[PDB]
Design a protein around this ligand. Structure first.
Ligand SMILES: Nc1ncnc2c1ncn2[C@@H]1O[C@H](COP(=O)(O)OP(=O)(O)O)[C@@H](O)[C@H]1O
Ligand SMILES: Nc1ncnc2c1ncn2[C@@H]1O[C@H](COP(=O)(O)OP(=O)(O)O)[C@@H](O)[C@H]1O
Ligand SMILES: Nc1ncnc2c1ncn2[C@@H]1O[C@H](COP(=O)(O)OP(=O)(O)O)[C@@H](O)[C@H]1O
Ligand SMILES: [Mg+2]
Ligand SMILES: [Mg+2]
Ligand SMILES: [Mg+2]
Lengths: 536, 518, 44, 518
């Protein structure tokens, strides 16, 4: 110091540092603080958790990404775990909780190896070689399902659909949600059974009713009523016709005006009466254009005034207002129609086709929500989910979203594996076997990853209330006795640790992604030596 | 290592379940007094502007009161959905869902049952519960006279809980006539409840017509006969053309005198097209200015101004006509009819009385009561009464109440508990014992015994009489068909499903995370 | 098999025992350096 | 109005009650984990001076923790006096008192029974319980071998919950041998607890004679064979003469030198009076000055100074002689004899060990351990054991333990529950469920299923047999006479009587008046 103010970085006294062994203990214990939150949540016997936002709204969730997303944290090590769960949620949409506890399992076993004095790069290189070795083994042992016909391929989705719904609420009606989830993909799929578009199916929840009232409808959900409700609510098609002849327009019902600011000057009373004639003839020509086109229901983007209500009512033409542009993207794909810009380009080939249009109340005074249904298979399915609470229907959205994502993973060819703790133990005993001859300096590194994989079965043992040591001892001895590797920890106690029989399947791409994100983050956290953090 | 920020309350221990369970018990005990016919009304003291509010419904109470517990929000939200869905039975969901968590508390503490086992028993117990209502219901659709009698007894049951327990004999006829008036339209927005303070509570009535809140403008008469009603939604007053870029290039003010005259000529021409229909009354939603008002005087047409858009829907259906605009084509357009129109006065504000209309697809109810709080309670009651009776038309099946609905569920639930031998039987019995408490609090509010009176109802049903129930005026068991009280199937289906699923929420919670307030 | 004979409530003793173990081990890490001939001295 | 003034909390009949019951729940849940053999010890951190205290006794847990709740102060005081009376069983009073109020909370809410009616059921239920407890007891002390064996079983049952649960087979001999050496004298002041750091828990050895932490003088020898022991409550210090108010007027310092000669000659003649008996040691209560200390050298007398008040009686009873101060008449006051007066060292402090005394009416328990927190637990553990076994000498009747005393008492209560008419019979059954909840908690702390063992124990005892009990090591029902589990009759009588009075005080409450604190 030598008396002068010895300052280097701006805000010297505010920020701190941390190094040596104490920096590591702050990292591993920070992961254990997050792992204790996730450990009591994972598995079918888990428990939900309430996340209170600053605005007073709550969300009852048991998925690791939504928990960590709405969690106000200060430690940076947990903030990387917040993004790891979000990484698993965005792409695969399965295993968020698993990655958080698996990455902590690698971190917890790494704490013992740091005490022995192994360099962190040798620790990180050991998990990288062990992770690829486990992926290379699990890719050989899993079987392909593409040889079976379409009748049995539907059953494999039901195996994974019941797996994803369970462990979540919506696990009662889960037998019908599995059929409803599989029925959504039967309508929306490619003929070659590959690269299905997920953006065609959007999520839509409704606060009201009960879970039993939910059903399948192929159409669009609009949160609005028809214009001037004097007409009958449920419009029917003609006796002989191809359909209702849906019409969509991105032009409001008005006289044509320039987009630029204009100044229409009327210097005479004769020109003023022609403006009155021009005002009326445009509305007369407009309703005659849609009349000759044969449209029954009209969808307008930018709304219209009250003059067109009576012209549309007399001709038996329902209509709506303030339909957003995102919904028109959904209407054109569902009804297979083309959106015309204007009336001069109006033609009968661009109009859509759907079965029927109708509206119901759902209760007393809530709001009139529009419903559309198709008479055949189309490229659009809109799940109509009901719920007794706002948190129930909110959790049912992200639960069913993960269900469709798990089925989306199975659309990829030859990616199936039987889970239930079997995938963890079958990848664990081989790593310990390789260490016996690949000893080197990294012998304990393989043993750490072998013990870290087994923690997820022990996590299931804690939630199910069984003895962990007796469970892992029986599974390890059974895997050594017989090379059949589809036996896992069954929590619902249906008897039989065997599992193809229970029907538990998880996607192969999802399971290998667990150790990848876990190992890839553990390689990053172990590199940190200096921890500089500034004050808020 | 405190990963969370400053001022972050987290509970990851037994206190989390205790804090979530005690919150529902506090919300549960708050509404125990409001249940039943002998229940006491409650009083709300607002924090802003001293605006008091007297209400018996639990949905309005719990939404108004502030509660920071996350468990309280679930009881607030399940009551809001029940208030919006059916409009009745909100306090039953609040007290039953809290009692299910109350009964589930001792299983967690004393017997040490897993939370997944308690919900698993409630799944099978709720399944057998709804199956009891499948066989216990009765369809009275084959006869309209019996269905007319069913709407009476449902009005007797719903209106008895509110302050109108004495005057329910008169409003039961008023309530059922409004439903037969609507002839199946379950939209509650088509009934205008005009609030009038003063007079006796039994002075309410239901006139065959639509009562306006406003009067005629300047000189149009009060009493007329054989008036043709025409409704319009367009401006009809100083017509600002659809493009606002219009202008007048005026070279001299003498020509601008002709332009303003031309605006009066087209308006004079528009009113001339109204006279082609040959009408005597004209109604428009926009407020009418002076110039078009004057031209109706010579034609002998009445004018009403500033009608609300929600009232135009009620006005069109009572009159039976149609809202007409673009008056060049009078042939295709339709207009209503009425026998007599007369302006009346109920209190200080005058109103327009319509009577003798052809269509009767809507009505208006005029309430008369001492205070604005009693009048408001009346509105909340009739709204809850008409909401249940409106859904009774689409859901014709009904269920007998008075403790018989909860007990016949428990008769089937207790039967199924033996065929599921193991530890799940205690959970199903807890669901059964939770249903016994609804007739218990109904007896406690009237000041009767909780054990002996429920014990007599227990023995009466197992003997082979599925029509026995509680009678509170005398304090003994009586037949429900003779007394004439019955609820709808959608109501009992809703409260059992809402209270069941509400118990599933706060049983799957172990950790409570509280971030900072904003 | 599952949902029988017990349910482990009051897990705060498990959380307290973990806090006491890491608290004792963190103090032991400072004393661990002074072991053996190649240990070091401490000034307090 | 406001008569009580500012900052005065008042409660009335719904805030008054349910604040004591939740306080009874709050104080009961703390001591729930400490009950039984598999109970976990609670650690208390002081607010000042960073003083920690490891303790299992429920009284000591409530002594240190501050509790502003008035209802919890009742449980604080009843554990204090229970520790004063018996010394063991304070946790059972707090648990049984809390569960009696937990049951009575449900009888007031669910069954809607008056509080006075609940007490009248508890009076008859407590009378039936004590009558069954009196008849279930068994006589003892007729055979000294059986009396020796029963004290060993009582010591094993007492130390099973403390830290000595693993080494109770060895400490039972140490506990019971000291009590028989008292020769009927019931007093705990005759037993010393010397704190020694080092060793392990099972290194505590039985001492022959009496040992204490004192030291010889500067010039005294190490060993004297067949030493005569004397105890002086005397002042061998600067005696002064006691007519305070004596001063010395001096005309010349010649006689003042002879006056100081007389002071030394005065004390010389006093030490010469000691040598007339021919003793070998001299024990004084207070400090001995150097001039008396030098005079014991040539006469061959040992010297021990600064003896505590308790140490005088503790050493005199082992010696057999009486405390002498006058030293005038050598005829009376026959002294004892000790063979080995050689001191030993246990740790860093030498202790004077005696052996081969006339009588052993006072004893000393030498303890070894690692931490002082464990030695403090060792002190409180054996203090409860020696207190129970000391009162077992005067009160001979005993009763079987292992939870059988609770269920056999509830058998007569359930038998007398049927013939009592009215609503108080439910309160009589509530008392029975309170007795049943103690063995329910013994199975929870051990980690085994509680409903099965309580159901098997309850069904087994009603068959006709009354010797069955809970075996928490194996987790099944077994014979208590084989395992050797028995407790005193006055212990369970005090627990049931104190718990009955505990519920009676808190159930007769209707308002709370909390004045302003100083
Ligand atoms: N019904 C079931 N039977 C057996 N195992 C299951 C069942 N449902 C889920 N699991 C297992 O529980 C583990 C954790 O899944 P979970 O945490 O619920 O999914 P996510 O991590 O995507 O939230 C998975 O490895 C899976 O194998
Ligand atoms: N006169 C009566 N006799 C017998 N039972 C009655 C009588 N009046 C009301 N009840 C019972 O009291 C209950 C009142 O419920 P209610 O207060 O309407 O619930 P909520 O207010 O939650 O809709 C009904 O279930 C009905 O069976
Ligand atoms: N070895 C044992 N086996 C079975 N039960 C025991 C055993 N030791 C004690 N108990 C039971 O524990 C209960 C309370 O023991 P106690 O010594 O009073 O503990 P505390 O001093 O903490 O109150 C007694 O009622 C007794 O039945
Ligand atoms: Mg999942
Ligand atoms: Mg009601
Ligand atoms: Mg004891």
């Amino acid at each position: 110091e030598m008396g002068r103010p010895f300052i280097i970085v701006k805000d010297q006294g505010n920020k701190k540092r941390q190094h040596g062994l104490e920096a590591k203990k702050s990292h591993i214990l920070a992961a254990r603080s997050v792992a204790s939150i996730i450990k009591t949540s994972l598995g079918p016997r888990g428990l939900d958790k309430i996340l209170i936002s600053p605005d007073g709204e709550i969300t009852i969730t048991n998925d690791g990404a939504t928990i960590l997303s709405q969690m106000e944290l200060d430690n940076e090590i947990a903030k990387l775990l917040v993004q790891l769960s979000k990484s698993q949620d965005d792409e695969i949409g399965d295993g968020t909780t698993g990655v958080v506890v698996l990455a902590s399992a690698l971190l917890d076993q790494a704490l013992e190896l740091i005490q022995k004095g192994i360099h962190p790069i040798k620790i990180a290189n050991g998990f990288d070689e062990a992770a690829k070795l486990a992926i290379s083994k699990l890719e050989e042992t899993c079987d392909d399902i593409s040889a079976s016909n379409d009748e049995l391929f539907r059953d494999f989705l039901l195996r994974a659909a019941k797996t994803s719904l369970g462990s979540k609420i919506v696990s009662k009606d889960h037998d019908r949600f599995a059929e409803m989830a599989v029925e959504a993909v039967i309508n929306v799929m490619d003929k070659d059974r590959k690269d299905v578009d997920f953006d065609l199916i959007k999520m839509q929840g409704r606060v009201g009713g009960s879970i039993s009232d939910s059903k399948l409808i192929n159409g669009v959900i609009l949160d609005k009523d028809f214009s001037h409700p004097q007409m009958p609510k449920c419009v029917l098609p003609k006796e002989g016709s191809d359909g209702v002849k849906l019409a969509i327009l991105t032009c409001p019902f008005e006289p044509p005006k320039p987009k630029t600011k204009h100044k229409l000057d009327i210097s005479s009373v004769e020109e003023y009466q022609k403006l009155q004639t021009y005002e009326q003839d445009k509305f007369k020509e407009m309703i005659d254009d849609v009349k000759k086109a044969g449209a029954d229901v009209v969808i307008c983007q930018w709304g219209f005034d009250d003059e067109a209500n009576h012209l549309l009512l007399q001709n038996d033409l329902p209509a709506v207002r303030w339909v957003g542009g995102q919904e028109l993207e959904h209407i054109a794909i569902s009804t297979n129609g083309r959106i015309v810009p204007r009336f001069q380009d109006l033609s009968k080939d661009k109009l859509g086709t759907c079965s029927r249009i109708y509206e119901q109340e759902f209760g007393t005074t809530k709001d009139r929500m529009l419903i559309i249904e198709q008479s055949k298979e189309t490229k659009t399915v809109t799940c109509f989910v009901r719920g007794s609470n706002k948190m129930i229907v909110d959790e049912a959205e992200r639960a069913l979203h993960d269900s469709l994502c798990v089925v989306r993973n199975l659309v990829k060819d030859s990616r199936v594996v039987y889970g239930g703790g079997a995938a963890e133990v079958t990848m664990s005993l081989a790593v310990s076997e390789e260490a016996d001859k690949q000893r080197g300096i990294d012998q304990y590194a393989f043993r750490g990853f072998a013990q870290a994989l087994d923690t997820i079965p022990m996590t299931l043992a804690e939630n199910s209330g069984l003895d962990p040591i007796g469970t892992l001892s029986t599974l390890k001895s059974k895997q050594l006795k017989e090379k059949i590797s589809n036996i896992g920890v069954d929590c619902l106690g249906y008897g039989s640790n065997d599992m193809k029989e229970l029907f538990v399947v998880d996607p192969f791409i999802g399971k290998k992604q667990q150790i990848l994100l876990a190992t890839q983050l553990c390689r990053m956290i172990l590199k940190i030596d200096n921890v500089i953090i500034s004050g808020k | 290592v405190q990963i969370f920020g400053d001022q972050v309350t987290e509970e990851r221990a037994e206190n989390a379940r205790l804090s979530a369970f005690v919150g529902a018990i506090a919300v549960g005990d708050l509404v125990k007094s409001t249940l039943g016919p002998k229940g006491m009304d409650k009083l709300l003291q607002s924090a802003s502007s001293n605006t008091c509010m007297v209400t018996n419904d639990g949905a309005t109470i719990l939404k108004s009161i502030p509660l920071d517990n996350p468990a309280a929000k679930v009881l607030v939200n399940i009551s809001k959905v029940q208030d919006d869905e059916v409009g009745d039975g909100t306090t039953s969901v609040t007290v039953l869902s809290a009692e299910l968590l109350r009964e589930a508390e001792k299983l967690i503490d004393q017997s040490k049952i897993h939370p997944q086992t308690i919900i698993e028993g409630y799944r099978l117990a709720s399944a057998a519960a709804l199956d009891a209502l499948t066989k216990a219901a009765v369809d009275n659709s084959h006869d309209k006279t019996m269905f007319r009698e069913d709407l009476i007894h449902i009005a007797k049951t719903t209106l008895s809980s509110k302050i109108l327990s004495q005057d329910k004999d008169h409003f039961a006829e008023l309530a059922t006539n409004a439903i037969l008036r609507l002839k199946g339209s379950t939209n509650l927005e088509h009934i205008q409840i005009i609030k009038i303070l003063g007079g006796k509570l039994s002075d309410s009535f239901l006139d065959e017509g639509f009562i306006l809140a406003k009067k005629f403008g300047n000189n149009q008469p009060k009493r007329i006969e054989n008036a043709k009603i025409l409704i319009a939604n367009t401006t009809l007053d100083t017509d600002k053309v659809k493009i606002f870029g219009t202008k007048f290039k005026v070279d001299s003010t003498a020509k601008l005198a002709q332009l303003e005259k031309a605006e009066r000529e087209k308006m004079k021409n528009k009113i001339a097209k109204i006279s082609k229909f040959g009408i005597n009354t004209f109604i428009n939603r926009q407020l009418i200015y002076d110039y078009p008002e004057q031209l109706f005087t010579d034609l002998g047409i009445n004018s009403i101004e500033h009608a609300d858009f929600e009232g135009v829907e009620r006005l069109a259906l009572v009159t039976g006509g149609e809202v007409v605009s673009t008056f060049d084509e009078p042939s295709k357009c339709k207009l209503g009819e009425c026998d007599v129109i007369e302006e009346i006065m109920l209190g200080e504000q005058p109103f327009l009385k319509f009577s003798g209309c052809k269509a009767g697809e809507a009505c208006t109810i005029v309430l008369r009561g001492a205070t604005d709080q009693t009048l408001d309670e009346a509105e909340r009651s009739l709204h809850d009464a008409l909401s249940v009776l409106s859904q009774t038309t689409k859901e014709t099946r009904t269920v007998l109440g008075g403790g018989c609905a909860e007990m016949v569920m428990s008769k089937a639930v207790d039967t199924e508990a033996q065929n599921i031998d193991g530890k799940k039987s205690l959970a199903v019995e807890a669901f059964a014992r939770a249903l016994r408490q609804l007739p218990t609090i109904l007896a406690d509010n009237a000041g009767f015994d909780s054990s002996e009176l429920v014990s007599k109802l227990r023995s009466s049903i197992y003997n082979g009489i599925s029509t026995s129930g509680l009678d509170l005026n005398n304090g003994t068991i009586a037949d429900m068909r003779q007394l004439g009280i019955v609820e709808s199937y959608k109501l009992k289906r809703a409260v059992v499903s809402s209270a069941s699923e509400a118990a599933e929420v706060l049983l799957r919670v172990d950790n409570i995370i509280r971030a900072r307030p904003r | 098999v599952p949902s029988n004979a017990t349910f482990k409530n009051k897990e705060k003793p498990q959380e307290v025992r973990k806090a006491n173990i890491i608290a004792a081990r963190s103090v032991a890490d400072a004393i661990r350096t002074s072991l053996g001939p190649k240990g070091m001295d401490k000034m307090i």
